[PDB]
Amino acid sequence: MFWRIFRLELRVAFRHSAEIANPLWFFLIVITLFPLSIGPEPQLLARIAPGIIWVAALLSSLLALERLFRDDLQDGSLEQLMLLPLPLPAVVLAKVMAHWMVTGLPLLILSPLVAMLLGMDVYGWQVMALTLLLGTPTLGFLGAPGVALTVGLKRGGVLLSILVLPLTIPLLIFATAAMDAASMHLPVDGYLAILGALLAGTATLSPFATAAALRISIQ
Amino acid sequence: MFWRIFRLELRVAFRHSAEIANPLWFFLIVITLFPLSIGPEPQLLARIAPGIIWVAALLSSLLALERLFRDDLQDGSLEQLMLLPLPLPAVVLAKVMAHWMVTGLPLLILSPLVAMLLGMDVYGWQVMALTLLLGTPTLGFLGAPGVALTVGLKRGGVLLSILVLPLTIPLLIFATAAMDAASMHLPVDGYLAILGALLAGTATLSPFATAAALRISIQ
Amino acid sequence: KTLHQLAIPPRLYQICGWFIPWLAIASVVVLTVGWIWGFGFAPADYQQGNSYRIIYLHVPAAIWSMGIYASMAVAAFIGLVWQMKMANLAVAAMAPIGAVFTFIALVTGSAWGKPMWGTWWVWDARLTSELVLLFLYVGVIALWHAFDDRRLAGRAAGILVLIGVVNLPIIHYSVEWWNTLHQGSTRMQQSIDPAMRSPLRWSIFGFLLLSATLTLMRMRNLILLMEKRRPWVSELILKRG
Amino acid sequence: KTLHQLAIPPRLYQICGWFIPWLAIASVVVLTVGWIWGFGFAPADYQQGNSYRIIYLHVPAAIWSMGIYASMAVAAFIGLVWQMKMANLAVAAMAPIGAVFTFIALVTGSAWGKPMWGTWWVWDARLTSELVLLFLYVGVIALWHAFDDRRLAGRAAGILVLIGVVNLPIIHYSVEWWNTLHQGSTRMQQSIDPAMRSPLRWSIFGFLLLSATLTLMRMRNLILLMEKRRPWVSELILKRG
Amino acid sequence: TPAFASWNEFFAMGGYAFFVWLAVVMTVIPLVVLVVHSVMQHRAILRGVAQQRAREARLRAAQQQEAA
Amino acid sequence: TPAFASWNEFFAMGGYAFFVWLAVVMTVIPLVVLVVHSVMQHRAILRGVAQQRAREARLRAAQQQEAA
Amino acid sequence: MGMLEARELLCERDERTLFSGLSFTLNAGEWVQITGSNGAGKTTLLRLLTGLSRPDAGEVLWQGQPLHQVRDSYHQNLLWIGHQPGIKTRLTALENLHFYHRDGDTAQCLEALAQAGLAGFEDIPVNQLSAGQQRRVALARLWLTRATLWILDEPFTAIDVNGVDRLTQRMAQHTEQGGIVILTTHQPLNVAESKIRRISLTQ
Amino acid sequence: MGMLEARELLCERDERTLFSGLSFTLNAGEWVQITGSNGAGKTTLLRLLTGLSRPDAGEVLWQGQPLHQVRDSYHQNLLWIGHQPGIKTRLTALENLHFYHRDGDTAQCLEALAQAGLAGFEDIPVNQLSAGQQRRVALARLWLTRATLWILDEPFTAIDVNGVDRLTQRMAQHTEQGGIVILTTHQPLNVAESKIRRISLTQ
């Protein structure tokens, strides 16, 4: 029944399709803001591009995190998902996987456009697409405790950022280190191995600590 | 009665003081993100610091903008504030001025610290404090229409950013150009004059386009 | 007069119905003549060579991607003062067309700047201003969609159309000053040799006609979307057959 | 036994009440001994000169800045298994003390780094790790404040304390590796000349006693907040006079 | 009167042949998407009204069954 | 046994005095603030309970007035 | 003339025609009650009557002028209490009532909060109060207002019978001089049928 | 034994002691109705029995085992309908009912949605439906479930009299085969007093 929840969340996401583009439009806003401040200089932008790309990715996923749980509290669907005959770790895993398929895949297909806007080569696009693929699920799994904790609040938009971003600091460092090594044309296999290790660890541990937070917030 | 609304909004904001610091902690986390991505090199950080400062300031103010109108929707206060014997332009002006005294003055007192973490000198701190003083009111008046429309929405966290940030692009260009002309020591009076000109124009035009908008959002 | 009868939604439906075909075929004729007299039967620039043909696919796609927005203000203004709902539907009618014209302007500008600059996207003032215009179109569309009620969504869209229009000279001149400060640009948008000019003007007028056709057809789409229960649609659909 | 009676709220209140004064005066004596044997009656580092006394004001303020958080983990763990509300209250008791200790560590680290680096903030691994720890403390405190119900706020704080402790070694070693590349660092925090050692250990134990005193005080404050109506407070305040 | 003397040389505009046809195709596609989307939207709204009004007729049939 | 021979030279810690005394003052102040906010909060809670219980006594006085 | 007159009000919330063609004029000193049958849609009528909601077609009039023009004189003579009480939960009850005009001095303060049933709970924060006692602050605003027109979306939601009796006595005292109180309530109210008027939005 | 047994449940929502020492056991095929006075706090009681909210003191018991252990068997035998219907407004009614178990084939679909009163509104989107008809999807979930335990927070809200009659007929039919329907309703209900049992959370 774990797949029925995932397929239904995909159906509700795909019904009004428009709203899933707003994370990538915000991502493109944040890509736009830095060269306006810095300048049009292509060497400085070529060096600074990992910082822009990953701060934009963190903020775009973070603002997209509201759709992960804020809908089902008001509709009452979150309660009924909690009393499904399934352990709530699996329900949380299904919601985070659907959220990655609705918020991380838009960034992964938008990846050629941002790779052409800043100026990275085809190796840079390959490493950034692979690192986005290994990192945006980790954004989902670190954001899920914060959303589960701050779904009861009316004003939970700044607080969710404050909780999530220090958790995403290690992924930030390894992702930007991977693409700093990629810009100098080095093999980035080890950095992707650490990225996959963090992905596996957070994917294992985050449903079990998001389920408890979600039980706390509803009651 | 324009001042009683302003004093009451200050009392509600100051009664639970803690929340006011959450914009500046989000600001400080966003300052923390780019040294970790770019690197600890002080010449590059000194060059990029205007961009970090204004991306952080726009995002901190933008996530802070939810408290400007979202509280009064559920409490029912906003309807009664339209039904005071006062033109709702003045009510909107009082709320935005109070929000600047709640969201912009924390940044202006935090200004020495973020000047210390980015290597700017005393002239750099002076220009960035003056530029924040002339810019964050403009941030409030441009954010007020976006909050006014996205107060009725359940999902108004990404949409608010999409509306507000292209409006605030000219503030970005003139502010970061002012700090670029401050880093290599030049008189920056003209850039501050343009900042004040945009401040006066948006302060003139934003209550009159926020009052009717807030009427649309609620009926 | 009949201008007051231009507010009844079924009457606007048949007026748009008979102005789609003739205006559409006129658009096809004018734009076909413009491109056939521009991408051939025409010289080339001396410096840029045979890459000047892009100045067709960009410049009606640029100017009208502002012009639609300017016309949008007019509709939004009619939405705010006289409380005309159908002008607020016209805003939502023209928002995707303006967004697509802006995307075309960006794509043709990048494809033009590659054989000169060497890369697809140099942060030029023109392309950056077009990108901000695209962002404003996305904001208007997302407001029109994220709301449930269509009427109030149109009123909301009209409000941000007017906000964007008031802030649009400021953004354009601030971006032009941004390129003034850092590094200059070449003569790209409207630095035209004579006798390559009339195909461009013909393509501009053809893009105007195509935008008017697409506007006048999505207006029918939105009118059918709101009046899905009133009996005039019933009489129309029983007339269908 | 009496460990089960330690979860009774009035009994825990008088246990904290008689534990504050004696532990506080012991803390004052030990920390005074520590600073007064470290700031004088002690040598100074040969290279850094007399700027090495700051290693007291940093290092009990650094280690216990983690220690409190680690102790917070223990309380948060007691929150989730045995469902003891007072451990979740102890999390909120210890979070501001850890935040203030972290702020002291950051400020003294910057004051130590000025006579060497020349700038108040060179992005060293230790100060960056303490800054991330401070952000974690602010997250815990702001969750404890945002919620209305105090019990549910403490349970939410326990959840995020366990999240932060799970992800904290990852942050520390990632920041350490972040200055494995991107230049290196000197031996500053725990490279100590002998005979300049017992003052630092005495100050560490004194900061432990001060943290326990402030914990034992704010635990009473939060207990008085939560049971503001129950009659044990009534008998206590009618005993006051 | 054509500037390009050879019709085969017309498809390769002086070396800069990829960019012109790239933007030609990337302009033709979104206009076709707009026209197809708008025509299909009009057809879909009309067919949705058809289904709704057939269901309204079935409501009328149910009312007649209740009346009889 | 003091490393600093002069007690006046103790206050000027070998040239590096401003940083040491700056962090000393900026360490003493926040801990004093935390102790003050831990004492004043306890006093404020107890006095707020006192006001609540005086008002509860006036509730009981009102109940006695209604009974009489 | 009557001051409040509604002329051909039609409302379509989410393309559902709640009411159409309703037009009623109200002379001074009457206590019309909006009967209704649906739960929402009479609240929409009250919000249309206060000027929160623009009529989709037709118009509301205050003393012969449309509501889009005479806002600064209409809002000076009206008191609106919706389903949400309209007070701030963060502030205290006395300061929440002092935000609204007068209050302050004892001629207009500390008996207005008492006659609603909130005697002795003046200085407590609102968020530590029961929901009926939260609504009684806005209900206590009645004894201090100078507004001729009162509009009430469910005034009697979780107030005890003595509170409803005091509210109806104050409301009838208001009705004695020139003034209209429009209200919507579920409960059958204990005033004679001769005084009241029922304006029902029929379906 | 009876399966659902409540033992010394104590709850303080926002430090207000809602109920204390309350302990009730339910044998099979009994039809307890909560008859408390306060609006909120009986909904809180239903959330404590369903396992949404942990009891602050005491425990809820299902077949002799506490609720923190037997979740995977308790949630196989319960159907909970709150004040919110628990369905998605974005999807259609048939897909919303198909989310919950079975539906699909005509043996368990398209008459379950009919006996709630939603015949002819099966494929319409939920957001274009009246609020009572939105609740009737969750109410239609009753005819397809195998859950022995049904717990209902205001089922007969915005429901026509024929709908309440049909719901009570299906609900007494459930009561026949050992099924318990724990419910809270505002309206006076048309079933004989011999069959019912009332659990009052006094004070």
Tab-separated table of C-alpha atoms in Angstrom, chain E residues 9 13 15 17 32-34 41 45 47-48 65 68:
chain	number	residue	atom	x	y	z
E	9	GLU	CA	23.328	26.833	-50.253
E	13	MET	CA	23.656	30.331	-44.551
E	15	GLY	CA	28.742	28.839	-42.174
E	17	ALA	CA	23.820	27.603	-40.391
E	32	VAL	CA	2.598	25.321	-32.348
E	33	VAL	CA	2.376	24.401	-28.648
E	34	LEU	CA	0.327	27.550	-27.955
E	41	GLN	CA	-8.524	23.571	-24.449
E	45	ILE	CA	-14.156	22.692	-22.387
E	47	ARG	CA	-16.704	18.275	-24.388
E	48	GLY	CA	-16.739	18.826	-20.621
E	65	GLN	CA	-38.260	8.318	-12.180
E	68	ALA	CA	-43.389	8.483	-11.732
